[PDB]
Structure 1
Amino acid sequence: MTDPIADFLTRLRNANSAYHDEVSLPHSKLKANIAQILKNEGYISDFRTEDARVGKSLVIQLKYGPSRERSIAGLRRVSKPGLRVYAKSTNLPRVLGGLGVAIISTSSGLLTDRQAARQGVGGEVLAYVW
């Protein structure tokens, strides 16, 4: 068992595929912060920082509603625990121009592609949201 990001994201991939209501998962720092960023983008619906019994938990609402059409295309994690990928501010991802928001961990923290460009700073490219 490892790579919490993969479960974090692939649980969403199942929920997106199945059109389930919400995804419940163990709480953690990165999970919460990332969830807030995705919400800021508006790819996801709201999410909760619950706390069942043994530790804390998280619940992410599946974003959809115009129709059965979900608002989330899919994703892929690119920095793998063994292939860490970092980029410089001037050769940053241009994945689905603008659209393909990559979440980057910089000296300041988690942020978007455009914000990263405006700051002019590199960092670790965790994953893509399509």
Structure 2
Amino acid sequence: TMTDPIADFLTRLRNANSAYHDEVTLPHSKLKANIAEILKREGYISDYRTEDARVGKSLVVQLKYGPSRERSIAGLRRVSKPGLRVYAKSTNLPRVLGGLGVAIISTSSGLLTDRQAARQGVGGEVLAYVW
């Protein structure tokens, strides 16, 4: 049972990075689209896209790798999952790699990066710790 689309998408991304893929195909969703917004604007995924398939709209992810073959994303771990969900206050926003990482936070405006949320003073739910 696909009981966590976000987790499955992140697992697919990290697995594709490990297997040295170029394109990852997933069913398309609004949450997937906006999360791709976040990651692409941060510069972790070279570029996304949404297409049309036999049944439902999907998406393909284009990654990058460091100039010396370097992996673009090192580790991917979900934080707030079905059952165990995690939130944060305006002051206790999570710190990843001492700021070297990006944590996806759901705030009133939408999903914004950790720095955006910290500067805006807004908070919400942290989605994934990307490094």
Q: Give yes or no for TM over 0.5.
A: yes
Mapped to 2, the partners of 1:68 and 1:115 lie a distance apart of: 30
Q: 1:65 deviation in Å?
A: 5.3
Q: Which runs of 5+ in 2 are unaligned?
A: none
C-alpha contact (below 8 Å) 1:22/1:61 kept by paired residues: yes
Mapped to 2, the partners of 1:10 and 1:17 lie a distance apart of: 10
Larger fraction in strand: 2
Name the SS for the 1:127 alignment partner. strand
Q: Between 43-52 and 62-71, report the one with greater CA deviation.
A: 62-71
C-alpha contact (below 8 Å) 2:86/2:125 kept by paired residues: yes
Aligned residues: 130
Q: Which runs of 5+ in 1 are unaligned?
A: none
Name the SS for the 1:40 alignment partner. helix
- For residues 70 and 108 of structure 1, do their structure 2 counterparts lie closer, same or farther at Cα, with a shift above 3 Å needed? same
In angstroms, what is the RMSD of aligned CA positions? Answer: 1.0
Deviations 1:102-129 (A, max 9, x none): 0010111100000000110110111110
**Runs of at least 4 residues of structure 1 off by over 2 A?**
none
Mapped to 2, the partners of 1:19 and 1:85 lie a distance apart of: 31
Q: TM-score, normalized by length of structure 1?
A: 0.95
Paired-residue identity, %: 96
